[PDB]
Amino acid sequence: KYSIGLDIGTNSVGWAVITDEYKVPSKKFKVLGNTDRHSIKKNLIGALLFDSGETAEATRLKRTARRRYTRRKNRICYLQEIFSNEMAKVDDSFFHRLEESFLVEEDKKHERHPIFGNIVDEVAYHEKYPTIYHLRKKLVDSTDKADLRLIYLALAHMIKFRGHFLIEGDLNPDNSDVDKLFIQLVQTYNQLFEENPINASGVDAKAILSARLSKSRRLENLIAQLPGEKKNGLFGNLIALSLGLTPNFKSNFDLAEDAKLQLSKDTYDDDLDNLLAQIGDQYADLFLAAKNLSDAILLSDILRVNTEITKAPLSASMIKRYDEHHQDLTLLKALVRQQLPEKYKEIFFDQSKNGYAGYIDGGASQEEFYKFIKPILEKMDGTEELLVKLNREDLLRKQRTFDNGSIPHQIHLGELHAILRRQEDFYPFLKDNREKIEKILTFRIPYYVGPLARGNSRFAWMTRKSEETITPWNFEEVVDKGASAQSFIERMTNFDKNLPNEKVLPKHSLLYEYFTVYNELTKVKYVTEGMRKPAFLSGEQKKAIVDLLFKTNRKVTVKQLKEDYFKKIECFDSVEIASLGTYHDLLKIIKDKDFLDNEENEDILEDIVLTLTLFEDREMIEERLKTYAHLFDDKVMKQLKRRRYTGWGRLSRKLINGIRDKQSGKTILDFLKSDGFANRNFMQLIHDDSLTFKEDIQKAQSLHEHIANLAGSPAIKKGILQTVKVVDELVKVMGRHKPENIVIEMARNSRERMKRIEEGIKELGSQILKEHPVENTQLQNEKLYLYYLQNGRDMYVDQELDINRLSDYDVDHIVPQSFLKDDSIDNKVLTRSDKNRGKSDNVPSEEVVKKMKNYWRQLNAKLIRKFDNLTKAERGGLSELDKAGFIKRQLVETRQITKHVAQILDSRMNTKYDENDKLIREVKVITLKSKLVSDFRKDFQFYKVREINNYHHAHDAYLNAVVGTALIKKYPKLESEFVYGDGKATAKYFFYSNIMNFFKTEIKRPLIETNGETGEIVWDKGRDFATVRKVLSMPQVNIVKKTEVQTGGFSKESILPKRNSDKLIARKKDWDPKKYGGFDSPTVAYSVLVVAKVEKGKSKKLKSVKELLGITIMERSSFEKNPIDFLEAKGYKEVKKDLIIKLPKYSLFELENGRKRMLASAGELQKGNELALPSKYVNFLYLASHEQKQLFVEQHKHYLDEIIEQISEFSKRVILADANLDKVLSAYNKHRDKPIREQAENIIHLFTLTNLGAPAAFKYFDTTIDRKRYTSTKEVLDATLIHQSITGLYETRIDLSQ
RNA sequence: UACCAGCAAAACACUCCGAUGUUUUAGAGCUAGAAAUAGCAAGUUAAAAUAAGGCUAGUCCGUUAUCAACUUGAAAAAGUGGCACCGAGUCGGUGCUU
DNA sequence: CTAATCGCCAATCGGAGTGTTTTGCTGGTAA
DNA sequence: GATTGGCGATTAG
Known part of the structure; x- marks a missing residue:
């Protein structure tokens, strides 16, 4: 009967239904609704388009910050609970004025001066300590009583910003000299x-x-x-x-x-x-x-002050910055005033000129300020001592900059410790609560404990020893910490696959090494003069090799087996031809051989190995082995704590020694240990039908979960669900008959560059960066990138190169492109001429290798596998087996994800079970690559271009189907690599290369092609090409766009100054946007069509209205809870409940003359039409843009005037743009002098005016055309709404003009 | 289609921490002139918020993944749309089973 | 009023630890 | 990492 061909991509899916002799049937369908249409006729071919999926990183990066913003606030709450009782006698409302700083004077209840509370004390305080560091330095070095408020301020500032945790242990800031x-x-x-x-x-x-x-x-x-x-x-x-x-x-x-x-x-x-x-x-x-x-020497870039003077080297070094600014400001002011009086109005008074006023008040960085001020300093006289500092970035510095991230947290702790001891005599309460303040600063949750939840979270795994509140002072008496580090690792370890509900063994265990080592030795063969045939190895030989070679070295060399055993024992001069690492370490540590040899002492070493592999901290390891003590002696534990392993294997423990040959003695492990007549490996033991393992192993072993459980990027896993649903929809249409075959094909920056070039220049010591400064949008070109990666030196010649000579130079692949199709940096080099590479069909000549080994080794530079291929000239070169394998891979789909998709489809397609505990095929699944179809198109002149319409998505599925069905039925024995389920290389290469030669005539073949047993008619070169040509030119393809609801952030994140508009959104409940500011860029989820009445004028004239309203993401729940009250609060009256209609994004409407528009929001529209240029012009346009075909291009030249007419006629009734069309016509009128090649290349640019989707700007020969945005959703209120299915064959139409 | 072996290349999922940026308030501008207007003097720091908010009241959760319309259903989803030809303006027609 | 064009804007930089597939020269071995 | 929908000022009815 019929067959189906698919084509999966990242933004589209195409389908087609071919029939007996490669034709596409058509059918009549039914249309529902209240319109005048009752039937329609459609073809079975189309496509589907959707958006792209994203990853979960951008959500994690905010989830792990919401928690820190709330954990930081609790640090200050603890400090205020120790100061409250004592402070309640000095100032009763000191802690109350600190919380209403972000409030206008009208809304304040207390006075407007935070710290002291009068106008004469605040000014005096501000006149004595200009910066907070003055107070910090004063408190440490003074010996007088101080006010409590200043102490609180200093402690709070020290605790809020605490530093980084990168050095473990104790620092000591006394040694500054080197x-x-x-x-x-x-x-x-x-x-x-x-x-x-x-x-x-x-x-x-x-x-x-x-x-x-x-x-x-x-x-x-x-x-x-x-x-x-x-x-x-x-x-x-x-x-x-x-x-x-x-x-x-x-x-x-x-x-x-x-x-x-x-x-x-x-x-x-x-x-x-x-x-x-x-x-x-x-x-x-x-x-x-x-x-x-x-x-x-690490405290040399932050601390730059002397000693034997102060005990606060960080605060004292931030006053030098303050005192070296007030001195340069006066000099600069005087110098500018004297020798340049016409510029003392924008350097110091303008806020939008990147001067000194635009650097303190406005917005500008240090780099911009320096770049703006350099000429002015250069022009005038004097200013020597200021030009040097500008080259050191020490001209006018601030005390809160971007380079303060190199300050350890052990420096802030010393000043706090020093402060807490000078004032512990006047205030006794500081003597008791002295060890808690130092603990608030240094507490840090371990990374293997996680959130402190109480069984109401999804990301938590922590246990508790007692139901109580967790505080930094009792963290060790509530959190178990013992079972919390075991559940951290065991919730991600893999399960077994031959016996589920079992955990795998450690990689470095004792049973696992026994299994691994002796399994390999079960099959080996050696030949000597005395022996007649290559014999196997016995268990005793393996034991001897383990004792003598494994126990002296973890890795056993084959030469060691040849010499130490054969020569010494068997007396063999010459002969031809795993690690027990745990055993030798345990022998060295325990120093008892009979302990490990004893087999009674089991369930002990496994526990020790698991303990060593699992935990990482030292107290944990000690306490775990504490019960495993009293047995050896005190000394062994000190060395046992120092051992650590890593790695997890893939095999259960019960599978090896739990269901072993208890009915035959020799275990599964012991079968490979002491072999006998049946030298059978583990695979033979499992996969044979002579023992009783199969029954027990086979006793044990939704669509969305299965698909989500695969491996791959989220962007591709979206195109499989849609494919499955399209298949299930297509099966129903054709009468509930399953398809005969299914053919599938799966079709598949700058910042990294400047980082790499900067690192290369810094490591190489090159000064070319200073010679040629480079911005952030210059070196995206590969030629200059490669030029700078080599310090501007040729690699085939050993000479310095030029920045504008690579233009006339060449870029060549290391391995010839005829063998490997690689276009990455690892394979491309820049050179003056490729002839300097040497041989053109192999790795570059050995002379270049010898002359550049040193520079290749220097490129330690991390700039460039590339070294190995360059040095391959001394290793004998390449083979042909890899070429044959790659040729097979070029057409055989060997990627794993395609196999997953094929298995998913096959499992659900065939369900009938054979009566003999098997399965019977009913549907074949065929996979093939895109090389065959591309070659077919190139050979038979079915040219395609991708910048006219989206019809080319659906023209590849048909070709896949026809090619696959034709090929599979002609060679009945090539199903091994083309159907799911289950010397010579040169012959296979030739055969696979000439597979596709049965279509052509001369390399003469008969017009009728027959196949073997029945002379099956698989091709007929008199009518099939006509059918393909007829199908490839049809003006009916079902294109469907998928409608989705929008989710994400509320609006933009920038905070704007105060204004007097109504588009601003408050940040909190009590903060009026007209006095504090807010965000303004709401995002709309969906729209609603309401018909109601509103009052107009003072007479409250109840006019009737029908318009569109937008519902944002922020207020979705309020609408979904009670629409009527929401609408009444908006301002509408007598809302008709039964006529509210939801409209998601990308909805379709129909205007008078087949003109269709989409819906992007409640204010804008989009385009929804397609162009159907005939098949002659496509061939002409493809040929013109690039032997005898030149002559044909020349004779047919008037075709350049027929495309323009069709474009204009299409744009005069659907697009409706006048100025753009007039400009296009005028530009085309005066440029008919250039030859056909460039005119075709610029005509192809004209198809952006009639492209489905959002409007965009294009460019002709010289003229630039802007956009034509539509900004009125008022006409669509009297049109028809169309609802479509996944394929588009089933639809309903509703008339909105009621 | 699975198990051991050397390295490299990656990609994906979860947890714990640093330094900036933006928005309001406090740090008493002065001299002439009714007035716009001119002349001059300072500028480096601190407090609060960082998706509006929730109930389960936790040193917890809030931007990834799924989604045509009607009839029935708590929910998921069981039931729901007749076949072949020619011409080739987006489909029309004829002949019948239906 | 009052509705339709035109030009500009959009949060960014570092560090530590644990677990799993998939590809590319190595293989082997075996069903 | 560009695209593609928001908002203010000008200008045409």
Whole structure:
């Protein structure tokens, strides 16, 4: 009978229903409603269009901030509960005036002065402490009684902003000098390693280690003055420890265990104690010193003040910024006043000129201010001392800038500690509540506990030991913390698939290693002169290999098996041819062999391994093994806490040793352990029919959930639901008969670039960025991008290149494009000429490799797999098997998601079960790629262009169907790679390349094609092409747009100043927008058509109205709860309840002459028509834009004047735009001088005026055309409304002109 | 179609923390002139909010995913739209079963 | 009044940890 | 990351 062909995409789905001999049937349908139409005739071909889906990141980024905004507010509430009783005797309303600051004077109840409460005290206070840091510095260094309000202000400011948590441990801000250190350091090296002393080389390491440089540059500068040292040397290792690195101390100390040390993690003490155990304490304070330096050079960019003067080095360094601004301002003012009197009106008085007034009051950043002020400073005389600071970004700085994110939280704690001790003698209540204020600052919830819910949330997993409120002071006596870190990991671990409801084993377990190691050794073969055939391996040999090779090295080399076993035991000179890592570590740690050999002591090691794999913190691990103590000794635990594993395997425990061969002895694990006659692997054991595993394993094992459970981007998983629903709708139409076949085909920046080029320039030391400054919208071109990635140097020649020479240069792929079709950065290079690459059919010549190995290694630059392909010239090159495989992949759909879709369709299509516990096929599912159809179109001249209409979406499904059905029925044995279910390479390559040669005539073939057994008629080259041509030109395709309701944010997020309009929305309930401001950009969900009456004039003339109203996202619930009261509050009277109609977005209307419009909102409209240009002009337009066909293009030239007539005629009755059409005609009238190629390229641009969708702007040869927005939804109130189904064949029409 | 092995490339889902930006109020502008108008002097900081709001009253939740119209249904969804030809103005016609 | 065109605007920058597929040279092995 | 619907000022009825 019939067949179906589909085509899935990210914004469209196409379908078609072919028949016996490649024809599309037509049918009569029924139309409902109250209109005059009672029937219609339609063809079975169409398409569907929809929008794109999004991801869940933008919602998480706000969910994880709503919680912080409310957790920060509770920190201040705790501080006010300790100060209330004492403050209730000084000022009764101090805490009340602090909450009504954001209030106009009329709405205030108390006075308008917050802190003190008079006009003569506020001014005095503001005249003594211009900034908050003056008070902070005064409180620490003074020894007098202070008012309570100032103490509260300082503490609140310190607590609100607290700093970052990146360094673990305790800081110490006393050592600011750097050189006492390089001295102190060397001092010790040669205080025990004397006679052989590293040379101090009078190194003034001051600028070497203190300059604002990177770690690598400081490393190169350190040993520059020392005559010869090693980057990997132990002095270098301890130096790298001083900076931020991860040195290893195994070298030069003949160690066997890795000794990676980090100075910022919270494990340094234990690792240092362990490392000082195998060497001793003779070399001790060579470390207490490396510490001092480590902290002495990271506190060098924020603290720039001296010592032995103050105990507050951060507050004292923010007064230098204040005192170096008031001094430069006067000088600049005087200099501008004297030598340039005509400009002292916009630098200091205009708020929209990026001067000094537009930098303090208006909106402007430091960069814009500097860029604006540089010429003015340059022109006049003097101003030497000010031009230098501008190059250091230290001209006129502010104390709250964007670069304050490098301040640790251990500095704010010291000032608070210092303040709390000077004033603990006058106020006794500060002596008791002193350990709580320090705890409010440093508390932080662990990342494996989550929200503190009470069983009313969806993202929570935490348990509780006692029903009580959780506070920072009792967090350890309420939260269990023991089972909270186990449910964090076990809620994401995979389940088994051969036996569900079972958890998988750890990767590094003991049973799992037994299974993995011995399974591999069950099949191996070796040949010697004495032996006759390649024999297998026995269990004893495997045990010996494990004992001698596995237990001496985790990885067992094949050479070790060849030499240590064969040569020593079997006496074999030559022969031809997994890790028990846990066992050797346990042997080294426990130091008891018979303990591990004993098989009674089980259910113990598995628990130990699970404990080590599961938790991460140290107290957790200790307490878990606390019950597992008293058995070995005290010493083993200290080393057991230091071991950690990672990884989860995929196999259950009961599957291995719970349903094993209890009826035959040898376990599933032991079957692969001590093999016998039946050397059968696990796959043979499961997949055979001789044992009783199958019954037990097979005893165990909605559409939306299944589809949502797949793997892939959300944007593609939207096109499968629609495909399934379209299929189910199409089956019903054709009489509830299932299709014979189904053919499916699934058709498939700048900031990264400037980040990459900036990193490359910074690491390479190149100065070309200063030479050629680049903005944010320049280097999107690949040629200049590649030019800058190489520091402007050729890579095939070793010469410097030019910024405007790449134009005449070339871009070439590393691997030739004839083998790999790659167009990414990893495959493209820029060169003066491709001939310098060497061979044109292989990897570049070895001369280039030898001459550029150094620069390829330098490109450590992270700018560029590319190195491997470039260096392949020395590795012998490529093969042909990969070419054959890729040729097969070019037409065989090997992607997994297509297999998922095919399985989903096949499972629901076939349901009848065979009586022999099997299934019978009724519908075939075929998958194929797009190469075949493209080749067919190119060969048989069915050209297509994509910028006329959307009909081309539905013209590919028909071609897929015809090609697939024709091909599958001619070769009855190629179903292996084309149907779902279940030397030579060159022959397969040729066969798959020439598959599609049965359509053509000469490479002469008969007109009639027959197939084997019956001479089946599969093609007839006298009428089939005529049918295809007739179908490809039909002015009837069902295009349908999907209607959706809108959701998302309420409006725009920008806050606007006060105004006197009625379009502003209040931010809170009691804040009038005419005195505080608000947002104004509401988003409409859907519209409603109401017919009612409203009063007019003072006489209340009850006129009758019928209009459209918009319902925003913000007020949906109020409307959906009671529409009548909502409408009455809006201002309408006597609302007719039975005539309210909802209208979602993208609704369809019908005007007088077939003119249709969509609905984008309650104020605008869209276009809803299509163009049907004949099939001759498509071929002419495709040929003109690019042998004998040139002559044909030349003879037929008047076609350029027939397209314009059709465009004008179509636009004069549907589009209804006059000025744009007149401009287009006038522009076309005077440009008939250029040849056909460019005129065709510009005629193709004219199809933007008649394109379905929103209006847009296009451009002709020179002229630019603007938009033609429609802004009146008043005419549509007397038209017809159309409701359509998913395919569009079923529809109803309602007349709104009643 | 599954299990071990080296690395690399990624993509997706959840939890815990930093620094800015924007909007109102406080930091007493002065000298001449009835008046617009001129002349001069300062400018760097702090408090509150950050989707309107909810009931289950928690140091909890609020921007992803699903959605043609009528008849019945709490809900999901069971029931609901007759076949072939020619011409080829968007469909029309004829001949009958219907 | 009063309704229709024209020109400009739209929140952004860093860090730490855990779990899972899918592709590309490696394979092997096996049903 | 551009698109595509909102709002103020001007201008034509």
